[PDB]
Design an enzyme around this catalytic site. Structure first.
Site, PDB file in Angstrom:
ATOM      1  N   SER A 172       3.598   2.292   8.705  1.00 53.29           N
ATOM      2  CA  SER A 172       3.347   1.165   7.831  1.00 53.29           C
ATOM      3  C   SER A 172       4.510   0.843   6.924  1.00 53.29           C
ATOM      4  O   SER A 172       5.338   1.690   6.585  1.00 53.29           O
ATOM      5  CB  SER A 172       2.063   1.314   7.055  1.00 53.29           C
ATOM      6  N   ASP A 202      -0.584  -7.610   1.392  1.00 53.90           N
ATOM      7  CA  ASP A 202       0.013  -6.292   1.513  1.00 53.90           C
ATOM      8  C   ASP A 202       1.514  -6.435   1.740  1.00 53.90           C
ATOM      9  O   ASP A 202       2.026  -6.359   2.869  1.00 53.90           O
ATOM     10  CB  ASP A 202      -0.672  -5.491   2.612  1.00 53.90           C
ATOM     11  N   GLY A 212       2.390   6.626   9.341  1.00 56.33           N
ATOM     12  CA  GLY A 212       3.817   6.749   9.076  1.00 56.33           C
ATOM     13  C   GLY A 212       4.638   5.533   9.481  1.00 56.33           C
ATOM     14  O   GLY A 212       5.824   5.462   9.145  1.00 56.33           O
ATOM     15  N   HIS A 260       0.814  -1.219   0.000  1.00 58.01           N
ATOM     16  CA  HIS A 260       0.000   0.000   0.000  1.00 58.01           C
ATOM     17  C   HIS A 260       0.851   1.274   0.000  1.00 58.01           C
ATOM     18  O   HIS A 260       0.342   2.356  -0.287  1.00 58.01           O
ATOM     19  CB  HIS A 260      -1.002  -0.005   1.163  1.00 58.01           C
TER      20      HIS A 260
END
Ligand SMILES: C[C@@H]1CCC[C@H](n2cnc(-c3cc(Cl)ccc3-n3cc(Cl)nn3)cc2=O)c2cc(ccn2)-c2c(cnn2C(F)F)NC1=O
Ligand SMILES: *[C@@H]1O[C@H](CO)[C@@H](O)[C@H](O)[C@H]1NC(C)=O
Length: 237
Positions: free
Chosen positions: A188, A93, A186, A44
């Site tokens: 991830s 992800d 911030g 992502h």
């Protein structure tokens, strides 16, 4: 990181800060060094990234204020996103960055081991989430890399908290039932790192959650052990 504390130099040598230079330079996501030319992060992160040329990987950073014009960084040759990825909440992800050069390992930049396929169902008890993200929902990127020890939550309990999302075996949840410590904006793409028998393993990739550090709303992480073969396939291509 909500409810975390400052890290020290050399504490998390696999953690990187991924910057984009467009339109202006900023921290975009965390990531983890996993090999000689390889960063593992979240798919992502690349939603608005036009090309690998605008990315910079900074390793060996404790403080964002260390990042200046002459600070060493690694360029990115290729962004590899899992071909089943659609959105964080539906899984897959996971992404690799193939760096423009190899990485010379030191105490401040070295790879984290992937989880052992033999430890697939292990309930790790020394797990930490790290990053430069927000300390609360409305905040700012932090200067010093933060850490928080967070417990793993069973997928069964996690699923009860997220009736609107499928929590699959390719996800792992972590957080305090009573709240207070979690990833936030911030963080991830960075690691959920668990120390097991004196070896750090990259158990999760920080992916998504509902709010930050709320009661009974654990953070959701990509379950790295379920992607070991994909990682090996892509890193040898
Ligand atoms: C494209 C990328 C990444 C976009 C997703 C990213 N993200 C989304 N969910 C989590 C998250 C994870 C867990 Cl395990 C638990 C709770 C989470 N949770 C829930 C809420 Cl609400 N918040 N966090 C962490 C995280 O980092 C993000 C980053 C920024 C702003 C907003 N979301 C951002 C930057 C650069 N600066 N900022 C700045 F605004 F923070 N990167 C980008 O936008
Ligand atoms: C790694 O170290 C070797 C030996 O000192 C050096 O020749 C090389 O340029 C270094 N490479 C990188 C990418 O730092």
């Amino acid at each position: 990181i909500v409810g975390g504390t400052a890290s020290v130099r050399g504490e998390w040598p696999w953690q990187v800060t991924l910057h984009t230079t467009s339109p202006t330079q900023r921290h975009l996501c965390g990531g983890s060094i996993i090999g000689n030319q390889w960063i593992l992060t979240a798919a992502h992160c690349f939603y608005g990234v036009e090309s690998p040329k605008i990315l910079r990987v900074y390793s060996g950073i404790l403080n964002q204020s260390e990042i200046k014009e002459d600070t060493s960084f690694f360029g990115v040759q290729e962004i590899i996103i899992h071909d089943q990825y659609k959105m964080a909440e539906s899984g897959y992800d996971i992404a690799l960055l193939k760096l423009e050069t190899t990485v010379n390992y030191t105490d401040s930049q070295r790879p984290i081991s992937l989880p052992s396929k033999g430890d697939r169902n292990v309930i790790y008890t020394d797990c930490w989430v790290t990053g430069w993200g927000y300390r609360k929902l409305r905040d700012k990127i932090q200067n010093t890399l933060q850490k928080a020890k967070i417990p793993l939550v069973t997928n069964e309990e996690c699923q009860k908290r997220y009736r609107g999302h499928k929590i699959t075996h390719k996800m792992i949840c972590a957080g305090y039932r009573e709240g207070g410590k979690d990833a936030c904006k911030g963080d991830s793409g960075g690691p959920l790192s668990c120390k097991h028998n004196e070896v750090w393993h990259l158990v999760g990739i920080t992916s998504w959650g509902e709010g930050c550090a709320q009661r009974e709303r654990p953070g959701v992480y990509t379950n790295v052990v379920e992607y070991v073969d994909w990682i090996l396939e892509k890193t040898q291509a």
